Structures are given as C-alpha cells and as structure tokens.
Amino acid sequence: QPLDVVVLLDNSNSMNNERANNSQRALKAGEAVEKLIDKITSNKDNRVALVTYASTIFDGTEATVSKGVADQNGKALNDSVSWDYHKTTFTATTHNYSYLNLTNDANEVNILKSRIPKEAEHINGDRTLYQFGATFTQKALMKANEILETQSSNARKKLIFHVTDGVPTMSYAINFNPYISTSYQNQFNSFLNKIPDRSGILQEDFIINGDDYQIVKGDGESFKLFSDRKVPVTGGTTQAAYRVPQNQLSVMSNEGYAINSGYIYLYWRDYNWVYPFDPKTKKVSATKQIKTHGEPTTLYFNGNIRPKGYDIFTVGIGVNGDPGATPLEAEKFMQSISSKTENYCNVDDTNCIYDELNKYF
Numbered sequence: 001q002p003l004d005v006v007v008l009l010d011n012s013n014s015m016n017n018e019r020a021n022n023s024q025r026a027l028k029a030g031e032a033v034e035k036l037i038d039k040i041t042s043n044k045d046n047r048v049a050l051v052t053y054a055s056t057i058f059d060g061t062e063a064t065v066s067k068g069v070a071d072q073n074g075k076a077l078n079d080s081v082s083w084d085y086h087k088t089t090f091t092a093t094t095h096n097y098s099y100l101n102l103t104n105d106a107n108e109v110n111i112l113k114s115r116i117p118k119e120a121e122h123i124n125g126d127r128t129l130y131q132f133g134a135t136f137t138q139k140a141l142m143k144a145n146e147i148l149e150t151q152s153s154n155a156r157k158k159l160i161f162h163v164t165d166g167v168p169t170m171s172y173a174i175n176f177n178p179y180i181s182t183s184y185q186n187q188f189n190s191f192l193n194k195i196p197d198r199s200g201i202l203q204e205d206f207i208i209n210g211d212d213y214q215i216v217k218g219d220g221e222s223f224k225l226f227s228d229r230k231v232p233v234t235g236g237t238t239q240a241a242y243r244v245p246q247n248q249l250s251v252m253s254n255e256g257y258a259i260n261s262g263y264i265y266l267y268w269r270d271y272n273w274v275y276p277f278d279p280k281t282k283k284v285s286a287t288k289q290i291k292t293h294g295e296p297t298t299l300y301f302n303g304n305i306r307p308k309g310y311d312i313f314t315v316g317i318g319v320n321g322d323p324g325a326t327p328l329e330a331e332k333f334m335q336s337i338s339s340k341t342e343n344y345c346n347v348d349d350t351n352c353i354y355d356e357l358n359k360y361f
C-alpha cells in the first residue's frame with residue numbers, strides 16, 4: 001500500500017538558530033524535513049503534507065494569543081519595556097510555512113519544500129510574531145491527525161514525522177469539574193477509563209470549544225505549570241511589582257487594578273498555574289495536579305492518536321529542555337509521543353532514523 005506522510009515541524013522560538021549555544025535547531029530541522037520529503041516522494045505513489053507550528057499552525061491565517069502577567073485578582077497587564085501595559089493579547093498574520101493537503105503532485109511538492117523555514121523568530125527580530133513562538137505540540141498533533149483522518153483511509157499506510165526540540169510549553173486544558181464532590185483524582189481516572197489501555201484522555205474531555213487565547217494553558221514561558229503563582233524578581237526570592245507612574249495612577253485605579261501604595265504586585269496569569277483549582281476560591285487541587293505541558297499532550301496523544309494504529313516518528317534536534325525541562329524530560333516526552341521507544345531518534349542518530357524508515361523504502 002502507498003504511504004501518506006504528515007511532517008510536523010516545530011518552529012517555536014526555542015528553535016531559533018542562536019539558542020543552546022548556536023545549536024542551529026531550525027536550520028537543522030528544516031534540512032531534515034527536506035531530506036524526508038525527498039526520500040518519501042522518490043516513490044511517486046506516496047503523499048506528503050507539512051504542518052509547521054508554534055503557538056499555532058503556521059498556515060498564513062490570522063491568530064491571537066494572550067500575553068502578560070496579572071495582579072492579585074487575575075487582572076492582566078504587560079510589564080515589558082517594549083509594549084503598552086494594555087497589550088495582553090496579540091493578533092497577527094502567521095507565516096505560511098505549511099502544506100495542508102497530502103500530495104504527490106511534483107509541483108505541489110515543490111511548493112511544500114519552498115515553505116520549509118530554516119529559521120525561527122528572534123526576540124529582537126519581528127517582536128510581534130515572536131509572541132506566537134510557543135510550542136503548542138498538542139494542537140499540531142491534532143492538525144496532523146485531522147489531515148490523515150480526513151484525507152487518507154484505513155487501506156493506506158500513514159506516518160507522522162515530527163521534528164522538534166521536544167519541549168512543549170502550551171497545551172489544551174483537561175476539563176475537570178470544580179462543581180461536583182468527586183475528587184479531581186477520581187475525575188481524572190474516569191477520563192482514563194474511556195481509553196482501552198487507560199493511557200490517555202479523549203478529545204471530548206479537553207476544553208477545545210473556544211478561541212485558543214481564551215482557553216489554552218501556558219504561553220510559551222515554560223514546560224512547567226507554576227505552583228507558586230507569584231512572579232519573583234529575577235534571580236531572587238522576593239515577589240516583583242509594577243510601580244505605577246504618577247500620570248498613570250488614576251487611570252489604573254479606574255480600570256480596577258489592585259494597587260498598594262502605589263505598586264501592583266505581579267502574578268503569573270492563571271493559565272500558567274498548576275491546575276485544576278477552584279475557580280471561585282482559587283484553592284489548588286488537593287488530589288490530581290497537572291504540572292507540565294508534556295503530560296496533557298501525552299494523554300491527548302495516547303487517547304486520540306496512538307489508537308489510530310499508524311506510525312509516529314519523532315526526531316530530536318539539539319535537545320536540552322529549553323525552557324523549564326531537563327534534557328531527560330524532553331527525551332521521555334518525545335518518546336512518549338512516538339509509536340515506540342525506538343521511534344524517537346536524535347537527528348544525530350542517523351542509524352536510528354535509517355532503521356525506522358527502511359521498512360517503507
């Protein structure tokens with residue numbers, strides 16, 4: 001049977017070529033993709049598609065994300081020196097780095113390959129698109145799956161080939177119910193009960209029905225969700241604050257910020273917090289706690305992708321855990337969202353990559 005392949009390409013900010021002491025993540029990821037496309041399409045029956053992602057799918061559409069910190073009541077502000085404090089969402093047109101239709105047309109293949117980026121955003125380049133540079137792996141997996149389920153069939157061979165540094169920093173929320181007495185652990189367990197092997201959670205028990213910027217967890221800050229909700233002063237122990245200027249003082253009060261003579265003490269916005277937590281009292285869960293983006297992503301993978309019975313190969317590029325994970329956490333995560341242990345390969349591990357692909361070619 002012919003092979004339909006979706007390439008998943010991580011174009012998050014962590015992939016910028018300067019990162020990890022010039023590890024050239026994006027350049028190397030783009031080259032690996034070029035090589036995979038050429039290899040797959042050598043057989044004229046096979047189809048390819050490309051899903052490049054970061055905070056969202058980079059397909060040339062407009063997207064919105066939330067940014068900033070918040071006061072003690074969850075009221076949002078941006079404390080950056082380069083943005084107005086009201087700038088707590090950003091809206092922009094993404095690069096079209098995707099080819100979203102499986103194809104074996106040679107001219108279409110050429111379009112796909114022309115759309116392969118070799119660089120990611122820089123904090124000093126496009127500062128607007130830099131805001132769309134989180135690692136929302138879950139969303140990209142959902143798009144790759146949607147493509148295969150929509151456009152392939154049970155009789156064709158299907159592959160997801162995912163190239164990334166392995167550190168997701170955004171995820172969809174697990175739909176815990178704060179209003180029943182069932183403990184969060186028992187709620188989580190009931191979600192697991194729905195998958196034959198209990199290793200995942202179905203899409204229906206994620207919060208998906210809303211625009212991303214209002215429902216998603218994480219903003220690219222970290223692999224981790226934060227147990228301490230207070231923003232600390234850099235390198236320190238003490239909570240940071242936003243001094244409100246004289247000229248600015250009355251407008252901020254009017255707006256409703258918590259100002260204590262005359263400082264707004266800063267908290268991570270609540271989509272960065274360990275959850276679930278009671279939405280009224282803010283009491284964190286005393287049982288099950290989600291503490292990374294890796295876990296909800298793996299659960300989604302295992303609930304909704306792995307059962308489809310096709311192959312998922314993950315290729316690690318310059319792997320160190322940036323931001324907020326260790327190198328091992330990143331590997332384990334990548335292995336967690338591959339068909340099996342040996343379908344995670346470092347890009348440097350050419351033997352691993354040759355061996356897995358050999359079956360098809």
Ligand SMILES: [Mg+2]
Pocket residue numbers: 012013014015133134135165167322
């Ligand atoms: Mg990243």
